[PDB]
Amino acid sequence: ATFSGHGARSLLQFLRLVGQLKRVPRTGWVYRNVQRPESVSDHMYRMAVMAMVIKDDRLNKDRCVRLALVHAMAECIVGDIAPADNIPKEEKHRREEEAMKQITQLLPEDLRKELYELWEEYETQSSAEAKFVKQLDQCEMILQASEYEDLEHKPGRLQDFYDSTAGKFNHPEIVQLVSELEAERSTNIAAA
Amino acid sequence: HGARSLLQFLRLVGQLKRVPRTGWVYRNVQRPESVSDHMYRMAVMAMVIKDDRLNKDRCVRLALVHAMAECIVGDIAPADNIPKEEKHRREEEAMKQITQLLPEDLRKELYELWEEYETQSSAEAKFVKQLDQCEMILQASEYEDLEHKPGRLQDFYDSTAGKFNHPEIVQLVSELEAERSTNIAAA
Ligand SMILES: [Cl-]
Ligand SMILES: [Cl-]
Numbered sequence: 001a002t003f004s005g006h007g008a009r010s011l012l013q014f015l016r017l018v019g020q021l022k023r024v025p026r027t028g029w030v031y032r033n034v035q036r037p038e039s040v041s042d043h044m045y046r047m048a049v050m051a052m053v054i055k056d057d058r059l060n061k062d063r064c065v066r067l068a069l070v071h072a073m074a075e076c077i078v079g080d081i082a083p084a085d086n087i088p089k090e091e092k093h094r095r096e097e098e099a100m101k102q103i104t105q106l107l108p109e110d111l112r113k114e115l116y117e118l119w120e121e122y123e124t125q126s127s128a129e130a131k132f133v134k135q136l137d138q139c140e141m142i143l144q145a146s147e148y149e150d151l152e153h154k155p156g157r158l159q160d161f162y163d164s165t166a167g168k169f170n171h172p173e174i175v176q177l178v179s180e181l182e183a184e185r186s187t188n189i190a191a192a
Numbered sequence: 193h194g195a196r197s198l199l200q201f202l203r204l205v206g207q208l209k210r211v212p213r214t215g216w217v218y219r220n221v222q223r224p225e226s227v228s229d230h231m232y233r234m235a236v237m238a239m240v241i242k243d244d245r246l247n248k249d250r251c252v253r254l255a256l257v258h259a260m261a262e263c264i265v266g267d268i269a270p271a272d273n274i275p276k277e278e279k280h281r282r283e284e285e286a287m288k289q290i291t292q293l294l295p296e297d298l299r300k301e302l303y304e305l306w307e308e309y310e311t312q313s314s315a316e317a318k319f320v321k322q323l324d325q326c327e328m329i330l331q332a333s334e335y336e337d338l339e340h341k342p343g344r345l346q347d348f349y350d351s352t353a354g355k356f357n358h359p360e361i362v363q364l365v366s367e368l369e370a371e372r373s374t375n376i377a378a379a
Pocket of ligand 2: 230259324
């Protein structure tokens with residue numbers, strides 16, 4: 001119940017917290033000694049483009065793009081928690097929830113409600129759009145894994161990331177895209 | 193399928209993660225942001241900076257697409273001294289190459305988004321151009337703060353003098369310059 005107001009100063013401060021996403025490297029790459037790992041905002045950027053180009057006539061894509069730009073936003077405060085950090089699901093949720101409250105309080109009421117709603121939709125996976133964006137997250141991530149493998153000239157190195165997405169995919173377009181990716185990568189591995 | 197081309201499109205887009213923003217590099221910024229970092233916050237700005245006269249989702253899309261050619265041509269800075277037509281020519285070729293990897297409806301949609309920004313042919317594109325400049329001077333003051341070197345990136349602010357007229361962005365920029373100036377006066 002803070003007293004920072006909802007003027008330009010608070011909007012600016014909201015924007016600074018958001019910019020901290022540029023300086024949160026994605027932890028999974030850090031823990032695997034990737035040189036120059038992407039930021040969390042790098043990751044959401046490509047998810048957002050993927051929402052634009054991976055087709056599904058049943059989905060509101062404007063909402064999918066917004067879910068993509070908002071879903072990881074709490075990491076500007078809580079940091080990027082990876083499976084290796086062993087934070088229980090409930091504790092990660094509680095931290096990120098508190099963070100989103102703090103962040104959105106800087107915005108006028110209608111904007112606060114809208115952003116928080118989007119975050120809540122994603123976190124509870126309550127819509128088809130939310131579930132779609134969750135698979136973009138996982139897809140975009142193994143794509144980036146294979147790109148770090150290519151850049152390193154170390155085919156297969158980041159195998160653990162592929163294994164962790166086993167059976168997490170069921171959207172027919174993303175499923176198709178993943179299968180193509182795994183086939184191209186598993187070919188490169190055999191070549192080497 | 194489809195899929196191989198889509199993947200190639202995605203890998204090109206991914207290169208944006210590895211294009212440092214050139215203006216920061218030229219000013220010895222440590223670990224400078226990528227072009228995708230820059231577009232990310234611009235897209236968030238389109239969501240939270242008010243204007244009921246604008247199609248915000250179109251602004252968000254313009255934000256995510258406007259600098260996309262840079263995955264091929266790189267980030268050209270003013271210091272690079274590339275003529276406006278030449279940069280336009282290069283980015284246009286790049287967008288054609290990029291978008292042709294997509295199905296026809298998406299290829300046309302995406303190219304037209306980029307062209308609308310490029311030609312500044314809508315109220316939305318003009319708005320997004322001011323987010324770009326605003327996002328950038330905010331980022332300059334952030335680098336100044338992180339470096340503990342206030343005012344060091346003044347050239348960037350000087351470069352934006354008189355480029356703002358959108359009422360909300362103007363308020364935001366005034367607020368930023370007053371906070372920054374106060375910090376500089378203090379130090
Ligand atoms: Cl994520
Ligand atoms: Cl830009």
